[model samples]
Target: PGRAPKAGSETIIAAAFSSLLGCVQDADADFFALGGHSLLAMKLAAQLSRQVARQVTPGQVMVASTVAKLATIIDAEEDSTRRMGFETILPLREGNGPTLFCFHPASGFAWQFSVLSRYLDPQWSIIGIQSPRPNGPMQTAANLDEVCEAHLATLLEQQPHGPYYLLGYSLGGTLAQGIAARLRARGEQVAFLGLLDTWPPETQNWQGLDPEVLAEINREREAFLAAQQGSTSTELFTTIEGNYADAVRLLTTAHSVPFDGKATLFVAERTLQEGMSPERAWSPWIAELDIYRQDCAHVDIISPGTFEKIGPIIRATLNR
Candidate 1:
């Protein structure tokens, strides 16, 4: 077993990047400049690791920044980070800012949290947890208890104890609530629980979702699935249709128990128009709740574009 002079390094890195980001043949071009983010960087690292048979971390990709530089790193650098086959935990950064743990959305990948990275100080370690069944069909947890137990088993290994800061989008937010409740049951502290555009009941957001708007939403969803390289993990599960059904099924089959912790909920302006409020649906179960609304659509909450308004609140909340 030996490392040789770089051969086909460009091909490998480019191949990996193409899957996660669009095909950008220019190796010298910077990844972030090419519309890549922390999430896509993590994905490229994992993908390149597989291709090169070396350990690569998102941090390395961040440092490398450019595709050509990353190729060199992949070919030249020795693997340092320990390899876990099912890398459920995604560490965006390990820094001085509050450590925020994010659960995955309906896509079953935690990559969406990368958007919030823009708002957070670079010192914070943004961590994400994703589903483990990379090989099986897109089968999510059966019930809240069933899923929470599974996710927490992995999560607790990283931190073991608490004063945990947690957030999730849509499906992930619901799971985050369940996780907070479980942690409290075990006598742990969840310093912050944030939910973005998540509804406790089925959805008030769907009110008057007419043919045109609903169709537009469908088109948007399709675009995300097809081109949003960050969520490539969703395709790793079962069929796309199966994943969708499973995600929708998660809401109906599993139920939520009350969480005694205080929560900060971010509302979508679009949903607000649809008459969706966290107070209307989630008030029954939460001990305390604060709401913030951003002028974004239901799905656009995590998009960096939403951060024009997303910046101030997230910054103030975490700092205070």
Candidate 2:
């Protein structure tokens, strides 16, 4: 079996903190009082991620300062992990309300969902879909349809049917639309579909790119890889590189099938690049597009400040 037996909550609590701050006399001991700085917290988070075999953030440690609270977080993560399929579906926010399934970007980490979690309504739960492989090499889907089919299996396994709420960023948005289309074709209801700063497939011309343009693309990829140094695990970056390659391969043949429903398009207030228009990029696939403008670039639109502006709007829609 691939599943690892879950250690008892108290056992985990004892082991986790003791390994960090020497012997733990009590479960109520303050985490910060034990010399838990940011770096230590990061290492502890990494350790916890290994223990769980899924991504765990330092902020989780900050919030769950006591051994008891940390145990609770671990318990919740363990519960979510059991329900996941091919994708490593981790909980960003554990809420009582309906579930929101977030797709991964080109990075394939699903870490972006954590940024939006704070802004979302407390009653709403949010889970993210990670890349296909957890410990092995990344697996590439032959086509967009194959991608949709695989993810759809994962979604239905967790929750049998809609009303479903789905959101994706960049290339993820394209996958989200494909998923929604497939769901609708099967007569399932999709409550909300959100696309953030995603370009329409028709706008792409990567197959016949010039040598100079390919070099520029390689330079951008290098920068993106460099930026992940502190933020994500090496395994995650490796998976991202593989996913990016798959995304590039799919782009040449990628074509959007109309959703035949409404979708909310979150556009960066500024252009992503020269001559990139949000409306022109999304209109063909979305029948009735509800546009929300955020004052930031493509990368920053999913950042904290941008979430502040759009969180309530997203919450209101989900609540409705």
Candidate 3:
């Protein structure tokens, strides 16, 4: 019965009024029934908090579940993006040395790769790739392999010449492996293939699960997306989850086949404590070359400062 308002028109009083709108409706008329939910409420709360320049929480979302109540909370938040601070992606204009293609983990944007690439050897040129489907365009990947193929197609289209180094973090590694393989197949020399804790099994692990069970899980995940925006559509859920599962498949398939040359595997020494077995630490190709283990978590391994240890590994392996 209403439309979304511009950020400026939204006021604390208006947000408070929005919360009261919840009570105006009958009990059976859930918050979502009035076009509200945790996600939408979170967005509202986030916006209001920005206007007021303050911190808001899920409790606030619950308290201001409707239009009337939410209007009051709007001014409590800082509306300025500056107050929110720090963006997700940072663009790199140009660089020297070899062209490095940096792939972000699942659900992440190119900005995520900026952290790692910034710390790499200054001589290397870095290009952070954002998955078209996950962040933009239409995501058609069924699993990690499909995502790899999709992204590889994009990389090949761009074509950074020999001395090209590939670095995929977490889910990104799944695609990076395939990229390394393609480069090798085309007789392109790849200086390094960096996988920052990805999963690609030689065979499918969840493959044995009943199709119905997997579909049920997919349904639930899709439900999450729909519920967030108060959407009943199940499309994005299937797409995101399928893309995620694909990344998992890529990581689990270790023996699926190695890239053309012996790849230098720089693994996080701490991943073993989290659940990744010792044997699953390095890819088959990576095991043959110098293995560098640093005292960092799977998430923290590729970050700056930590690269001091990882840099030597790549340097020695590349014979730089």
The runs of at least 3 residues in candidate 2 whose Cα sits more than 4 Å from the true structure, single-residue gaps closed, are 1-87, 134-138, 206-233, 272-276
lDDT of 2: 0.67
TM-score for candidate 1, residues paired by index:
0.69
TM-score of every candidate relative to the true structure = 0.69, 0.69, 0.52
| Cα lDDT tens digits for candidate 2, 4-85 | 2235764565677788777645666546545554345566666776676656555466555566666666667455532232
Q: What lDDT does each candidate get?
A: 0.67, 0.67, 0.51
Please estimate how well model 1 matches the true structure, expressed as its whole-model Cα lDDT. Answer: 0.67
Worst 10 residues of 2 by lDDT: 1-10
- Model 2, residue 306: displacement in angstroms? 1.3
Q: Per-residue lDDT of 1-320 in model 1, one digit per residue for the tens?
A: 22322448776776676776776466655565456775576667666666676667665665555566667666663643322223577664456756888887765666556566557776777787766454322374665567677877877887887888888888788889988989999999888898888777445323322335534654565554334343234333333344455666565665677899899888897756346456878877788999888887887888877765765587677775
Q: What are the RMSD figures for all models against the true structure?
A: 7.1, 8.0, 13.3
User: By lDDT, highest first, what's the ranking?
Assistant: 2, 1, 3
Stronger candidate by TM-score (1 vs 3): 1
